[PDB]
């Protein structure tokens, strides 16, 4: 997986990536901040409509999925898999609220990569 280009986690200035959250923190406190982006080298799935997504702290990480699909507005033939922290969620038994505080970093922003491959590793 020899990476070449920086990651939204690295590239974007942490402090800047932390502040951006502040807003959502002072605006959407009852929401879990996440950063969904195309996998480094993703040519399948289209470029998400947005990068920032406000997930409800009253659902399961799964929802976010059913939510993404809507965004990507893919067909029942298209394959889409949101990788949380770079790892699929084959097992979604945790709330986006926890999955966040269980993954997200001090920054306070989740980082997930979506693509048409959940077993590319």
């Amino acid at each position: 997986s020899m990476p070449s280009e920086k990651t939204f986690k690295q590239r974007r200035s942490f402090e800047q990536r932390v502040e951006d959250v502040r807003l959502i923190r002072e605006q959407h406190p009852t929401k879990i901040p996440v950063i969904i982006e195309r996998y480094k080298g993703e040519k399948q799935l289209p470029v998400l409509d947005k990068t920032k997504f406000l997930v409800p702290d009253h659902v399961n990480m799964s929802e976010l999925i059913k939510i993404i699909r809507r965004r990507l507005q893919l067909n029942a033939n298209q394959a889409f898999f949101l990788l949380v922290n770079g790892h699929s969620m084959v097992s979604v038994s945790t709330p986006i609220s926890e999955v966040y505080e269980s993954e997200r970093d001090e920054d306070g922003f989740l980082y997930m990569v979506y693509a048409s491959q959940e077993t590319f590793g």
Binding site: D20, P33, K52, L54, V55, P56, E63, I67, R70, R71
Partner: peptide, 17 residues
Amino acid sequence: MSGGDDDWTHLSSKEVD
């Protein structure tokens, strides 16, 4: 308007299939 990060996207499970 995208002249700032006023409000990100809304993840509503009501607009889902």
